[PDB]
């Protein structure tokens, strides 16, 4: 093909869109509703407008290149068209960037600045209560910011295949929301927050828990524990212009100490706990020749997916609590026993890359003796905002260590944030358990990677079993519907709601499509975790010294007794 773009001649054999071809050839074309190789088919934003000679104005994001095309991307007709569209968007947009949580990384603002657009008449609502929905424990909607770009709808469609995020006709006007405009919690929504990640503006956010945390920190009698997820240490640096794939663990510890937190632990410890209980459970399931298959239960998005679509699998879920909830359970029991603290005065806070964790933490039965396992859950973005509000120079902070009692962890718990991590860790412990040995080769690279459905054959006590790793909720739906589950007899299956694992969680830092093109965010974030794994002395969860001490002195043997009594949680079908 011979393509003419801005007077420059190209000769290509590629069959792609004008947008992609221009992007690959250093030619600037703006875009808004185009994301995940999809645009808003019904009401296209037309920000990607270009002028094709002989045809007129077209949308470059969904228009294929053709030989003989003379394309103008910067003609004044194009520019005033785009500016017109952006102006129309401003007409329905509360343009107050000051107290906005997307102030420092908003695509729409950058478009407005770029094309110097102004609203015909400024959108300034007196009563935002009609536009705001905070009923959910995980998600919040602010339709004063919504551009109706449909990126959340699409993202929900491709990531989960639930379409829990829909276009709705709210008595006259088009909005986005859950079915029947109900609270997302009351629908088949997984609360995975991929819709948030896809949103270019502040229309979609996480349900804030920062006030819980602040009030806890300022409360004189409250002893505040904080523990961050595996993924957090490999992600938050992005929000401080430190780049991608930067390990900032120690900096996070220091910052958390400077935020006034009373105890600094780590969720990876709880991951090691989860591996203790669940590998014990898998070994005893193997010895009893059932029940098979056993699914992981550490992902609340997947748990909700089972509750809403496959309730018959609820009893197939591991009884072991998620790292978060099991850590929280241990923090209200074991920790006071080794600290002398009043359990009622303990306030446990987790830092998560996930929004569904908020819902999981606020489950009614996720407590004992009136004491919540987890009292508050803040996202990576929330912790970043908290650090910035305290004016803490994160990038320049020196490394510190976590409090050892419940802060030590192995590489097995370290790789949890990546797809296949839980599987690999669980195998590392189960193989050692069932064979009564301490094996040398512990790397299971077959369950790693970004393949949607991963399958492996493992040999435990010289008998072979089939394991599977489901990477994404849509892939769970594919795995079940296509009958792949019934092809062979699977024994242990990992399921994560977010593709790539927790490192691509709904509470993770937003990434400009600019870097989505240049950086493989999932692999780059996971690489930090695996790098931590290969550089750790202990790479098995049952070699965690602090954890071993905890079990020996307090819980006893995992999988049974008080361990099974309080560190486990089972879900019931209706
Ligand atoms: N609880 C828990 Fe997990 C652990 O450890 C996180 O904390 Fe994950 C991460 N990162 C999240 O959110 S949940 C699903 N299992 C894999 S990793
Ligand atoms: S969503 Fe973006 S453009 Fe709108 S107020 Fe917030 S920062 Fe400004
Ligand atoms: S909530 Fe965000 S992603 Fe969804 S339509 Fe509105 S602006 Fe677009
Ligand atoms: S939280 Fe997940 S399942 Fe729910 S609407 Fe958003 S993307 Fe869809
Ligand atoms: S994969 Fe991780 S971040 Fe995503 S919903 Fe599950 S627990 Fe949350
Ligand atoms: S980006 Fe092409 S129509 Fe929206
Ligand atoms: Mg399209």
XYZ file of C-alpha atoms and ligand atoms in Angstrom:
628
model
C 0.000 0.000 0.000
C 1.035 3.593 -0.659
C -0.294 5.850 2.095
C 0.019 9.634 2.176
C -0.026 11.089 5.686
C 0.649 14.803 6.207
C 2.513 14.960 2.901
C 4.711 12.015 3.861
C 4.621 8.904 1.671
C 4.669 5.435 3.222
C 4.843 2.035 1.544
C 3.490 -0.843 3.618
C 1.858 -4.265 3.325
C 0.230 -4.063 6.749
C -3.549 -4.282 7.039
C -4.282 -2.153 10.099
C -6.112 1.010 11.151
C -5.022 4.579 10.400
C -4.523 5.143 14.125
C -2.210 2.171 14.689
C -0.222 2.806 11.506
C 0.308 6.448 12.458
C 1.254 5.407 15.996
C 3.847 2.973 14.641
C 5.296 5.693 12.406
C 5.750 8.425 15.030
C 2.675 10.326 13.830
C 0.527 11.876 16.556
C -3.186 11.083 16.608
C -5.311 11.762 19.682
C -7.826 9.197 20.926
C -10.216 8.784 23.846
C -12.804 6.001 23.660
C -10.348 3.647 21.947
C -8.893 1.160 24.426
C -8.180 -2.589 24.469
C -8.497 -2.600 20.665
C -12.075 -1.354 21.027
C -13.909 1.954 20.707
C -17.402 3.138 21.632
C -19.229 1.634 18.642
C -22.570 3.308 19.360
C -21.460 6.832 20.248
C -17.894 7.275 19.010
C -15.974 10.113 20.673
C -14.411 11.049 17.317
C -11.319 12.432 19.054
C -9.337 10.317 16.590
C -10.745 12.292 13.656
C -8.514 12.539 10.588
C -9.116 13.931 7.103
C -8.967 11.425 4.251
C -8.733 13.154 0.870
C -11.827 12.409 -1.204
C -13.763 10.869 1.678
C -13.811 13.522 4.398
C -13.501 13.267 8.173
C -13.168 9.714 9.500
C -12.394 7.973 12.791
C -8.835 6.655 12.556
C -9.221 4.146 15.394
C -11.588 1.920 13.406
C -10.804 2.819 9.793
C -8.458 0.530 7.863
C -5.669 1.986 5.740
C -6.148 1.789 1.974
C -3.764 2.349 -0.934
C -4.295 5.782 -2.461
C -5.240 7.379 0.849
C -4.101 10.953 1.382
C -4.552 11.606 5.092
C -4.453 14.881 7.022
C -4.203 14.540 10.801
C -3.639 18.207 11.615
C -5.905 20.121 9.231
C -7.987 22.865 10.846
C -11.227 21.077 9.959
C -9.943 18.097 11.934
C -8.716 20.301 14.782
C -11.991 22.202 15.113
C -13.933 18.940 14.881
C -11.938 17.422 17.745
C -12.096 20.690 19.692
C -15.862 20.710 19.149
C -16.196 17.179 20.530
C -14.046 17.979 23.571
C -16.068 21.156 24.149
C -19.281 19.125 24.071
C -17.704 16.773 26.605
C -16.851 19.773 28.788
C -20.502 20.839 28.604
C -21.394 17.788 30.708
C -18.239 17.719 32.831
C -17.610 19.178 36.286
C -14.242 20.711 35.427
C -12.811 21.143 38.930
C -9.393 19.479 38.810
C -8.258 20.905 42.160
C -9.830 18.391 44.577
C -9.961 15.643 41.929
C -8.231 12.293 42.489
C -7.252 11.984 38.819
C -5.747 15.489 38.803
C -2.216 14.258 38.127
C -2.943 11.623 35.467
C -6.209 12.475 33.695
C -6.427 11.862 29.938
C -9.378 14.216 29.464
C -7.566 17.130 31.108
C -4.580 16.545 28.829
C -6.911 16.575 25.823
C -8.522 19.826 26.995
C -5.088 21.404 27.443
C -3.896 20.053 24.091
C -6.778 21.390 21.999
C -7.430 24.386 24.267
C -11.144 23.571 24.374
C -13.728 25.357 26.506
C -17.280 24.419 27.464
C -20.130 26.226 25.708
C -21.764 26.516 29.149
C -19.861 25.176 32.241
C -21.400 22.119 33.934
C -21.818 23.063 37.596
C -24.364 20.858 39.420
C -25.689 22.037 42.790
C -26.571 18.552 44.029
C -24.018 15.864 43.180
C -25.879 13.247 45.237
C -27.951 12.459 42.144
C -24.762 11.834 40.165
C -22.830 9.928 42.826
C -23.220 6.282 43.877
C -21.225 5.161 46.929
C -23.438 2.244 47.970
C -20.802 -0.340 47.045
C -18.090 -1.538 49.425
C -15.594 -1.561 46.560
C -16.672 0.795 43.775
C -17.840 4.408 43.540
C -19.353 6.225 40.565
C -19.247 9.980 39.936
C -21.200 10.757 36.770
C -20.220 14.432 36.846
C -16.939 13.190 35.386
C -18.270 10.505 33.040
C -17.588 11.050 29.336
C -19.713 8.069 28.260
C -16.655 6.724 26.438
C -17.765 3.178 27.224
C -14.246 2.060 28.118
C -15.483 0.648 31.427
C -18.224 -1.323 29.673
C -15.768 -2.726 27.146
C -13.118 -3.501 29.786
C -15.719 -5.349 31.850
C -16.757 -7.229 28.725
C -13.271 -8.420 27.774
C -11.833 -8.989 31.263
C -14.767 -10.735 32.949
C -17.355 -11.394 30.209
C -20.000 -10.568 32.820
C -20.973 -7.190 31.368
C -21.804 -6.098 34.909
C -21.032 -2.586 33.699
C -23.782 -1.583 31.279
C -25.104 1.402 29.387
C -28.396 2.369 31.012
C -31.266 4.643 30.040
C -31.810 6.508 33.300
C -35.238 8.077 32.627
C -34.147 10.101 29.610
C -30.356 10.236 29.788
C -27.647 7.672 29.049
C -25.458 6.646 31.981
C -23.277 3.687 32.914
C -23.875 1.389 35.869
C -24.913 -2.004 37.200
C -28.049 -3.790 36.001
C -31.290 -2.087 37.121
C -28.971 0.708 38.322
C -28.550 -1.417 41.447
C -25.586 -1.395 43.797
C -22.775 -3.321 42.087
C -22.517 -5.566 45.151
C -26.085 -6.753 44.555
C -25.383 -7.934 41.004
C -23.115 -10.510 39.353
C -20.347 -7.904 39.472
C -17.025 -9.298 40.686
C -15.912 -5.951 42.133
C -12.593 -6.559 40.360
C -12.295 -2.885 39.438
C -11.046 -3.356 35.877
C -13.646 -0.778 34.872
C -11.826 1.671 37.147
C -8.480 0.848 35.535
C -10.027 1.464 32.113
C -11.581 4.811 33.064
C -9.719 7.836 31.622
C -11.247 10.147 34.239
C -12.425 10.211 37.856
C -15.906 8.906 37.055
C -15.007 5.515 38.515
C -13.097 5.154 41.773
C -12.518 2.760 44.655
C -14.632 2.962 47.801
C -12.371 5.080 50.005
C -11.180 3.655 53.326
C -8.673 6.429 54.018
C -10.871 8.052 56.675
C -11.081 4.747 58.556
C -7.290 4.590 58.545
C -6.791 8.232 59.547
C -9.304 7.994 62.395
C -7.633 4.782 63.559
C -4.180 6.387 63.461
C -5.364 9.438 65.394
C -7.330 7.392 67.928
C -5.141 7.294 71.082
C -6.094 3.778 72.198
C -5.914 2.192 68.744
C -2.843 0.147 67.822
C -2.647 0.254 64.037
C -1.056 -2.626 62.146
C -0.345 -2.193 58.440
C 0.525 -4.881 55.896
C 0.950 -4.481 52.144
C 0.120 -6.962 49.387
C 2.819 -8.623 47.224
C 2.001 -6.413 44.229
C 2.179 -3.074 46.070
C 5.975 -3.151 46.402
C 6.228 -3.609 42.634
C 3.751 -0.919 41.616
C 3.419 2.168 43.825
C 6.730 3.661 42.656
C 5.022 4.444 39.354
C 2.926 7.079 41.110
C 6.103 8.837 42.240
C 7.678 9.075 38.776
C 10.222 6.380 39.657
C 9.402 4.384 36.530
C 8.182 0.823 36.045
C 9.380 -2.438 37.579
C 11.053 -0.708 40.508
C 11.252 -2.560 43.823
C 10.367 -0.014 46.512
C 9.695 -2.331 49.474
C 11.935 -0.653 52.057
C 10.760 2.791 50.981
C 7.190 1.646 51.572
C 8.134 0.388 55.039
C 9.747 3.735 55.892
C 6.821 5.745 54.505
C 4.351 3.610 56.455
C 6.337 4.292 59.616
C 6.301 8.020 58.840
C 2.528 7.894 58.320
C 2.203 7.051 62.006
C 1.404 3.348 61.719
C 2.121 1.472 64.944
C 3.174 -1.867 63.457
C 4.740 -2.740 60.103
C 4.013 -6.262 58.878
C 3.466 -7.831 55.454
C 0.670 -9.710 53.674
C 3.209 -12.127 52.161
C 3.470 -13.592 55.666
C -0.248 -14.312 55.416
C 0.432 -15.772 51.981
C 2.861 -18.194 53.599
C 0.117 -19.008 56.122
C -2.352 -19.629 53.297
C 0.199 -21.926 51.677
C 0.622 -23.848 54.939
C -3.112 -24.458 55.312
C -3.891 -25.021 51.623
C -0.917 -27.257 50.825
C -1.794 -29.295 53.901
C -5.354 -29.403 52.551
C -4.138 -30.496 49.112
C -1.948 -33.254 50.528
C -4.778 -34.575 52.697
C -7.102 -34.329 49.685
C -4.590 -36.373 47.694
C -4.358 -39.011 50.421
C -8.157 -39.236 50.620
C -8.430 -39.427 46.819
C -10.709 -36.393 46.896
C -12.594 -34.264 46.717
C -11.299 -33.099 43.330
C -10.779 -30.575 42.000
C -9.707 -28.111 44.681
C -9.840 -24.438 43.721
C -7.934 -21.558 45.291
C -10.011 -19.149 47.376
C -7.631 -16.226 47.878
C -9.198 -14.125 45.113
C -12.482 -12.472 46.218
C -13.298 -11.636 42.594
C -13.134 -15.314 41.691
C -15.036 -16.200 44.867
C -17.810 -13.821 43.806
C -17.661 -15.325 40.313
C -18.274 -18.759 41.821
C -21.032 -17.440 44.084
C -22.780 -15.800 41.132
C -22.189 -18.298 38.316
C -20.936 -21.640 39.662
C -22.251 -22.163 43.223
C -21.630 -25.909 42.892
C -17.926 -25.027 42.999
C -18.224 -23.265 46.364
C -17.472 -26.533 48.162
C -14.553 -27.121 45.792
C -12.892 -23.970 47.119
C -10.009 -24.296 49.570
C -11.212 -23.818 53.144
C -8.077 -21.770 53.833
C -8.657 -18.032 54.215
C -7.044 -15.552 51.833
C -3.654 -14.123 52.911
C -5.416 -10.880 53.894
C -8.143 -12.463 56.026
C -5.903 -15.156 57.517
C -3.327 -12.488 58.408
C -6.067 -10.400 59.971
C -7.339 -13.394 61.915
C -3.828 -14.041 63.215
C -3.417 -10.347 64.074
C -6.368 -10.324 66.474
C -5.303 -13.542 68.198
C -1.623 -14.526 67.933
C -0.212 -11.001 67.801
C -1.852 -9.860 71.047
C -0.568 -13.089 72.599
C 2.974 -12.075 71.662
C 2.609 -8.325 72.268
C 0.336 -7.987 75.294
C -1.896 -5.646 73.326
C -5.632 -5.637 73.948
C -7.137 -7.441 70.909
C -10.052 -4.988 70.846
C -7.564 -2.124 70.515
C -5.873 -3.686 67.488
C -6.758 -2.103 64.139
C -5.567 -4.065 61.106
C -5.022 -2.252 57.804
C -3.999 -3.826 54.501
C -2.622 -2.195 51.365
C -3.982 -3.926 48.276
C -3.868 -3.686 44.466
C -7.488 -4.784 44.604
C -10.947 -3.298 45.156
C -12.672 -6.643 45.757
C -10.539 -7.003 48.891
C -12.641 -4.227 50.415
C -15.771 -6.334 49.966
C -14.004 -9.438 51.264
C -12.823 -7.615 54.389
C -16.346 -6.400 55.147
C -17.993 -9.816 54.909
C -20.215 -10.273 58.010
C -18.666 -13.594 59.070
C -15.091 -12.395 58.524
C -14.700 -11.865 62.270
C -14.450 -13.622 65.631
C -15.597 -12.561 69.110
C -16.788 -9.275 67.613
C -13.307 -8.557 66.273
C -12.926 -7.983 62.532
C -10.136 -9.853 60.761
C -9.475 -6.747 58.690
C -10.694 -3.310 59.763
C -9.728 -1.305 56.672
C -8.412 -1.858 53.146
C -6.689 0.863 51.130
C -5.660 0.530 47.491
C -2.190 1.237 46.103
C -3.535 4.540 44.795
C -4.994 5.345 48.218
C -1.661 4.729 49.937
C 0.058 6.872 47.311
C -2.412 9.716 47.853
C -1.960 9.363 51.611
C 1.825 9.557 51.263
C 1.594 12.612 49.002
C -0.853 14.371 51.338
C 1.624 13.892 54.183
C 4.254 15.426 51.885
C 6.556 12.436 52.341
C 9.491 12.361 49.881
C 8.891 8.728 48.891
C 11.489 8.553 46.111
C 14.259 9.732 48.437
C 13.348 7.608 51.468
C 15.952 5.194 52.820
C 15.125 1.499 53.161
C 13.855 0.113 56.459
C 12.816 -3.367 57.576
C 9.408 -4.771 58.499
C 8.651 -5.893 62.050
C 9.672 -9.587 61.998
C 6.844 -11.184 64.036
C 4.418 -11.175 61.100
C 6.534 -9.408 58.486
C 8.954 -12.101 57.327
C 8.173 -14.022 54.141
C 9.580 -16.463 51.597
C 9.784 -16.149 47.817
C 6.805 -18.483 47.588
C 4.620 -15.890 49.284
C 6.456 -13.186 47.362
C 5.321 -14.409 43.932
C 1.650 -14.428 44.966
C 0.818 -11.241 43.058
C 1.541 -12.905 39.715
C -0.648 -15.379 37.833
C 0.553 -18.875 38.700
C 2.326 -17.701 41.840
C -0.126 -19.286 44.271
C 0.025 -22.518 42.272
C 3.830 -22.593 42.290
C 4.113 -21.828 46.014
C 1.434 -24.368 46.916
C 3.285 -26.962 44.844
C 6.580 -26.065 46.532
C 5.035 -26.840 49.916
C 2.785 -29.770 48.944
C 5.585 -31.677 47.208
C 7.693 -31.383 50.363
C 4.761 -32.355 52.585
C 3.506 -35.468 50.798
C 6.978 -36.836 50.037
C 8.309 -36.004 53.517
C 11.376 -34.393 51.953
C 13.032 -31.052 51.198
C 13.225 -30.877 47.407
C 15.739 -28.814 45.460
C 14.045 -27.792 42.207
C 11.177 -25.492 43.192
C 10.590 -23.495 40.013
C 7.411 -24.294 38.090
C 7.779 -22.110 34.998
C 4.925 -23.893 33.201
C 2.293 -22.174 35.351
C 3.852 -18.756 34.746
C 3.223 -16.306 31.918
C 0.281 -14.419 30.444
C -1.417 -17.366 28.736
C -5.107 -17.256 29.638
C -5.368 -20.912 30.597
C -2.242 -22.716 31.763
C -1.968 -26.457 32.365
C 0.688 -28.628 33.992
C 1.284 -32.221 35.050
C 3.055 -32.550 38.391
C 4.415 -35.613 40.173
C 3.722 -35.830 43.906
C 5.008 -38.867 45.830
C 5.672 -40.383 42.391
C 1.996 -40.266 41.480
C 0.958 -37.744 38.839
C -1.737 -35.084 39.160
C -3.098 -32.355 36.891
C -2.961 -28.683 37.850
C -4.406 -25.664 36.067
C -3.967 -21.909 36.381
C -6.824 -19.695 35.238
C -5.595 -16.233 34.280
C -8.619 -13.930 34.210
C -12.338 -14.307 34.921
C -13.211 -14.451 31.222
C -10.775 -17.357 31.038
C -12.644 -19.012 33.903
C -15.828 -18.716 31.867
C -14.010 -20.124 28.834
C -12.494 -22.939 30.900
C -15.900 -23.980 32.238
C -18.184 -23.401 29.235
C -15.871 -24.988 26.659
C -15.783 -28.176 28.723
C -12.025 -28.032 29.262
C -12.762 -28.826 32.909
C -14.205 -32.183 31.823
C -11.385 -33.089 29.431
C -9.221 -34.569 32.180
C -9.362 -34.949 35.953
C -7.916 -31.792 37.493
C -6.839 -31.931 41.128
C -5.752 -28.384 41.985
C -6.809 -25.223 40.147
C -5.725 -21.605 40.642
C -8.122 -18.831 39.620
C -7.437 -15.092 39.472
C -10.084 -12.580 38.388
C -7.596 -10.120 36.886
C -5.516 -11.156 33.869
C -1.854 -11.222 34.852
C -2.730 -11.713 38.501
C -2.967 -9.228 41.368
C -0.255 -7.087 39.752
C -2.968 -6.010 37.306
C -5.520 -5.428 40.057
C -8.323 -2.877 40.014
C -6.690 -0.833 42.761
C -3.411 -0.518 40.874
C -1.934 2.760 39.554
C -3.456 3.996 36.294
C -1.191 3.672 33.274
C -1.416 6.014 30.291
C -1.933 4.097 26.997
C 1.344 5.809 26.056
C 3.151 3.309 28.255
C 0.641 0.512 27.665
C 2.052 0.540 24.144
C 5.681 0.729 25.289
C 5.562 -1.283 28.527
C 4.166 -4.739 29.290
C 2.842 -3.661 32.689
C 1.912 -7.179 33.856
C 5.234 -8.879 33.107
C 7.186 -5.844 34.308
C 5.308 -5.746 37.620
C 5.558 -9.530 38.102
C 9.293 -9.486 37.344
C 9.962 -7.663 40.617
C 8.145 -10.398 42.531
C 9.992 -13.254 40.829
C 13.266 -11.368 41.288
C 12.498 -11.181 45.000
C 11.799 -14.917 44.905
C 15.112 -15.913 43.328
C 17.092 -13.660 45.685
C 15.542 -14.899 48.936
C 17.157 -17.491 51.203
C 13.831 -19.065 52.140
C 11.743 -19.854 49.061
C 9.196 -22.134 50.715
C 6.334 -20.989 52.944
C 7.042 -23.686 55.534
C 10.582 -22.348 55.918
C 9.315 -18.982 57.148
C 10.958 -18.882 60.586
C 8.514 -16.390 62.117
C 5.597 -18.388 60.724
C 7.041 -21.667 62.014
C 7.433 -20.078 65.448
C 3.840 -18.845 65.253
C 2.485 -22.300 64.418
C 4.636 -24.109 66.988
C 3.824 -21.738 69.849
C 0.215 -20.821 69.092
C -1.696 -22.619 66.322
C -0.085 -26.059 66.377
C -0.304 -28.165 63.225
C -1.939 -26.576 60.143
C -4.995 -28.064 58.437
C -6.398 -29.310 61.741
C -7.260 -28.300 65.299
C -7.491 -24.618 66.175
C -5.625 -23.901 62.940
C -8.502 -25.308 60.898
C -10.898 -23.810 63.438
C -10.100 -20.105 63.098
C -7.787 -19.764 60.078
C -10.290 -21.318 57.665
C -13.460 -20.075 55.964
C -15.967 -21.989 53.840
C -18.671 -20.638 51.531
C -22.212 -22.016 51.475
C -24.505 -22.305 48.471
C -28.072 -21.054 48.941
N -4.990 -11.668 50.255
C -4.297 -11.716 49.353
Fe -3.177 -12.044 47.819
C -1.677 -12.165 48.742
O -0.698 -12.358 49.375
C -2.938 -10.075 47.652
O -2.658 -9.570 48.695
Fe -3.356 -10.449 45.833
C -1.835 -9.464 45.599
N -0.819 -8.809 45.471
C -4.401 -9.071 46.016
O -5.286 -8.244 46.206
S -5.026 -11.895 46.470
C -5.274 -13.314 45.246
N -4.084 -14.203 45.439
C -2.779 -13.707 44.936
S -1.998 -12.291 45.837
S -11.718 14.037 35.729
Fe -9.838 15.021 34.851
S -10.631 16.863 33.730
Fe -12.317 16.171 35.125
S -12.021 17.412 37.037
Fe -10.891 15.437 37.354
S -8.746 15.893 36.678
Fe -10.068 17.576 35.843
S -17.163 5.669 33.831
Fe -15.179 6.294 32.859
S -14.748 4.634 31.328
Fe -16.962 4.433 31.903
S -18.077 5.663 30.317
Fe -17.701 7.073 32.094
S -15.725 8.122 31.577
Fe -15.872 6.290 30.200
S -15.813 -4.458 38.998
Fe -15.217 -5.996 37.397
S -17.119 -7.246 37.071
Fe -17.771 -5.340 38.174
S -18.384 -3.893 36.502
Fe -16.177 -3.458 36.966
S -15.012 -4.761 35.472
Fe -17.166 -5.567 35.506
S -6.743 -11.162 40.919
Fe -5.984 -10.070 42.795
S -6.475 -7.862 42.404
Fe -7.718 -9.082 40.903
S -9.739 -9.391 41.952
Fe -8.455 -11.227 42.451
S -7.455 -10.694 44.449
Fe -8.251 -8.729 43.574
S -10.995 7.093 19.728
Fe -11.801 6.721 17.715
S -13.965 7.065 17.924
Fe -13.170 7.302 19.962
Mg -15.495 -0.310 16.865
